[PDB]
Amino acid sequence: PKTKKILQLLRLRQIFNGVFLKVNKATINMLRRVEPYVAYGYPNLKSVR
Amino acid sequence: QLNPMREIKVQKLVLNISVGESGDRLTRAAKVLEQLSGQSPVFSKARYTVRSFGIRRNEKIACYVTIRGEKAMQLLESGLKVKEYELLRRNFSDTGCFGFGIQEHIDLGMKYDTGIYGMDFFVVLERAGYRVSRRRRCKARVGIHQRVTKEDAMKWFQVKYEGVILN
Amino acid sequence: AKSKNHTAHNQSYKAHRNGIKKPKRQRQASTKGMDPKFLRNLRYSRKHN
Amino acid sequence: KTRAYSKRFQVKFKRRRQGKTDYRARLRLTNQDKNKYNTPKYRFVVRFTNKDVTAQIVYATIAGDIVMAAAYSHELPRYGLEVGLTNYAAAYCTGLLLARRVLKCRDLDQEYEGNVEATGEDFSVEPADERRPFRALLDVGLIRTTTGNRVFGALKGALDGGLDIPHSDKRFAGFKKDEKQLDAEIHRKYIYGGHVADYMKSLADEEPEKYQSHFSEYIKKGIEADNMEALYKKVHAAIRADPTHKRYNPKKLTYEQRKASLVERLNALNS
Amino acid sequence: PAGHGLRSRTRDLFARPFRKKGYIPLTTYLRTYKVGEHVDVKVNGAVHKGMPHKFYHGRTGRVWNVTKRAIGVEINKQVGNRIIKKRIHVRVEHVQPSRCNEEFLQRKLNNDKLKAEAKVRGEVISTKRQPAGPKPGFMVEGTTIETVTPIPYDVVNDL
Amino acid sequence: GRRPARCYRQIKNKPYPKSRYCRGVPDPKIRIYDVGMKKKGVDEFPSCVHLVSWEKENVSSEALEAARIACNKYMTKNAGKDAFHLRVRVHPYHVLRINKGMRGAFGKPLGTCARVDIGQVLLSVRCKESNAVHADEALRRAKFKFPGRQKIIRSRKWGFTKFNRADYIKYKSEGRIVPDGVNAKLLGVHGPIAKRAPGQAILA
RNA sequence: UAGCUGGAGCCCAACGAGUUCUAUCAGGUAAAGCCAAUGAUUAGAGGCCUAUUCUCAAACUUUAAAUAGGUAGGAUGGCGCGGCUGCUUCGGUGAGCCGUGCCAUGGAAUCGGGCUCCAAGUGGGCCAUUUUUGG
RNA sequence: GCUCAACGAGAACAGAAAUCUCGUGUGGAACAAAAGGGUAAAAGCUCGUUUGAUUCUGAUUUCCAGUACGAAUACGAACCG
RNA sequence: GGAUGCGAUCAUACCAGCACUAAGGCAUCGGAUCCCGUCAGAACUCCGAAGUUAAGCGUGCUUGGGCGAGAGUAGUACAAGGAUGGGUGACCUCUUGGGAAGUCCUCGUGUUGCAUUCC
Ligand SMILES: [K+]
Ligand SMILES: [K+]
Ligand SMILES: [K+]
Ligand SMILES: [K+]
Ligand SMILES: [K+]
Ligand SMILES: [Mg+2]
Ligand SMILES: [Mg+2]
Ligand SMILES: [Mg+2]
Ligand SMILES: [Mg+2]
Ligand SMILES: [Mg+2]
Ligand SMILES: [Mg+2]
Ligand SMILES: [Mg+2]
Ligand SMILES: [Mg+2]
Ligand SMILES: [Mg+2]
Ligand SMILES: [Mg+2]
Ligand SMILES: [Mg+2]
Ligand SMILES: [Mg+2]
Ligand SMILES: [Mg+2]
8 A cells, every 4th residue: 555655646557657756855765665666767868858 | 086076975775674465564664664764664566476475466565765864874874883884895786886784673773672674775875966867857877987886885885984895 | 153253454444445534624623621711701701802 | 789779779859869858848839720821839938047047939940949039037137136046036027028028029018018016916918909919838848837836937927028828827836726726915925035035034033154155145245135025126117117269179180180190009009 | 441441551651761760850840831732642650640541642732721730632543434633631740842843933933034034135035945855966086995895704703 | 202393393482481470390301501520720621612503493401411411421431521511501491382172272381492593502512622523523423412403613712711712812921811710701990999919900 | 333335416626645754752572681670590710798600581671673653844824003801910910812904935745636415235254475372 | 757678786584586776778668459550758657637438510531333331530610628 | 169048950960988178158066944846855846156167068089889971782683675586494695775782992970040148
């Protein structure tokens, strides 16, 4: 249930869905709890565009 | 130190009589202390049931009295006279107190022909300032330099009643 | 025949279907149970406004 | 003692270890109803030393007690009383002086003038129905509250001064246990020093040698047993008129002094 | 009732802290509580009047009533589907003022002062907290660098 | 007789000591824990070997006594009754229950056993360096009495103390070790200065 | 009987949230301790005592986590001026409330639309990672 | 108002335990009862006065359906110790 | 640099053993008519002011015990999440996070309010 709730606040309700997250302590500790369910990194301009 | 406050005086003298039962013996025992002090003696109850001594709980078995002033000075003088001024080294406690016994109160002077009775003499020696340990407010210990120990108490008996400590 | 005695299994899932209901925050909280002195006095002061 | 004893010992409050405060009594004296909020409970603190009488109006805060007004016996010579500064009479004078001082501070002295002549019986200043009299609670401390205790002499003085102190008459000097009532005549005698004056008469005649040594400062000041009533009567009137670094101990040693001394002692044992 | 008494399994909960028994300090007794204030509930086992049930130990709530020797405290309790705002009266010995809004109360005063300056200067500002974020770039001078290496395993020194 | 040790080998329960709540507990089989020269000075035996358990399991009082006897007998015969000190380092404090259908199955005491973990020392032998090889053989014979896996480890300490040999000798030269049986307390820099003796007071 | 569910609606759109962050409370489980109290327990050393020493505890404990628990993070706030009280105070002294004029850039992140009625079925459960009792 | 268990040193009968005295004493005692908490100018012991173990209903807590009963707590309105 | 009264915190403040203190205040101290009080003016109470700093109180010292803060123990013990991880198992690895406690060593031994008052 905790993993289900966090992935709802990140809007990741489906597999292979992608979002942009801005970095701060609040968001990073949210991501650590759903680490096994997710892959993330730092995008570049080509990726964003 | 030769401070004039550091003089040893008798704080009080306690005469104990321990009969072990209640009845005419205790009442005649109490009267002897009435004669020798002038104040009503206070009885002491038993605290345990002991078959060997034949005493039950809360039974009047003994009586005693506390004397201070010149009266206790004269009683101690007459009591120590019965010993002919011959105490023992063991008789002195290390807190500055000593005692002895009297087999028969007839040697104290009173004829009392109440009966035949002895008594336990105990005498507390103290200096001034002992009030600090007995006053209600701001209780405190009396300080080692103002305390009476065995050395002073034994010296006090030697030079006041020309008494000799036996070994 | 013996049966099961007690379990909390599925009870918290049942409690979150209509997820835990917080009472409605109302201005003017009820004065019931307040000490009757200062309650009648407040009533008298309002009456004499 | 053992180190296990020290490890598990809990120290009492500091003023309990000093034997100066009954914390059960102080709790019931200072604890205020919570629906009275920051309204303070005032105390009427009366303390006797071997030579002085201390009277204070005190209320308690977090940082410590705060005094509203204080009075002492040793300042009574400024008004006219120089001897017997710890008897029932001077206790009455101290209580009267403190009561006059507080009423001045709160602008209540004119509104509440108590008994201006030390009546000698039970008194309570009647509330004026617009401004109630100042209310304080007597705090006696560790003394034993006996009948005729000087703390009730100061209580009587504060009552005559104009303060509202919840009390009874069962402990004034003069109350009879076998009759359950107070002798206001005997009380007035104590308030004006009659019990002391009777002793002087009961000493100047039969034992003049004891009389001189006992009441020495009375004689040296020329006070006689017949001037006491006028002396205390003038003091009460006078109070109601104008009631208003070389170091000698050692300091603690420093680290560089403590260790320097230690090197010398350790070598001395070693050699 | 019904299998468990009022103070059941409170052997550690209601015990006093170590070497902290005996007298109760005067600070406990002359703290001031008003309606709307926040207080923590902490039972102490020497005071048996006004004792709250063991559930409210360690909970923070609002003051809703004040009496002579006690205060009314409002505490949330989850009972199945919902939260019930429980209202209990507790003696002052088992209650302490809460610091759960101390940082908020000072910040509100400061935000008022900061927005006051923006009024004088004519600017528009935020005074809104922001979580800790990514650090900006920076340089470190050439200094000593210590080399860290895996250590060979030793059987004897394992214990 | 009694159940085979496999029935109680694994640590499954919470500790169940003999106490006021557990009564009627038969006594342990092992009553002696030190054999050989127990009253031997700390400066005599610098050699120390250990039998270290590498498993987390129960060890019975029976298995402890059998190992003690087997370790002891080889040492006395092949090295002398005077040349060693052997110490059992585990005490059986756990009570095993036996339920002698399933209604009211809580069991009565069966026996006592020790609860041991990985790295826990089971046995210790202190001797001289000339007999250190015989010490490994007696510990090797002892390990056949225990269930599971055990290792024999050459300790770095001097005898039964907590001091390494390189530092026990360094302290001894400096005059800073007072021998109390086998314990060899290392005196320091605290306590009354008058409590020390000329040569036994050290700054820092 | 309450909970879980459907149907009927109705009332509205700042309010919230099976989450984090900032701050602040509470705890005695793991571990540890016995060279600290209670209890158990091996051994020597020096003079019953002293200083050490091996090993322990669901119904022992000074210390004491991780994970979980509670609270708060403004417009339902604040400040003046003026009133009311039969409550409170020595006292406009306080506690509140009433009226009135001003102030309050929305007070961390992320996400997002959310009062009453009537009733059904259910009230044998089972399995798995981790913790855990009896055997 | 007082301080308990226990210990140390003392006093004819009287010793391991009869009664008295001084010193130490964080509770190692006691508090009807089981166990756990709690308490030292007390909540323990001794003495003095007493009947609040009283009247009227409300509210809250524990159980909880958040019903009842039992038990408890904080007020109010009396009358008392 | 001191005190006294009433306190706050309630050992950095306690405990043990030693040493010392101007002025003042405290205190010890003298007495038992009166109030009061006991077997006992010891205590409590009342009245005093001959003597004393002996005690108390205050301050300091000790390679003191305890208490408090550090460092270290130690990224150890334990523990949240993950693995179609290793192993016969007991258990243990790695990955994303949190993170203790004795011994040992160092340092410290109070701060402070209101009123009056001494230098
Ligand atoms: K049970
Ligand atoms: K084996
Ligand atoms: K520990
Ligand atoms: K222990
Ligand atoms: K049903
Ligand atoms: Mg089944
Ligand atoms: Mg069923
Ligand atoms: Mg009292
Ligand atoms: Mg029931
Ligand atoms: Mg099991
Ligand atoms: Mg436990
Ligand atoms: Mg454990
Ligand atoms: Mg249904
Ligand atoms: Mg009990
Ligand atoms: Mg009751
Ligand atoms: Mg006298
Ligand atoms: Mg002195
Ligand atoms: Mg120290």
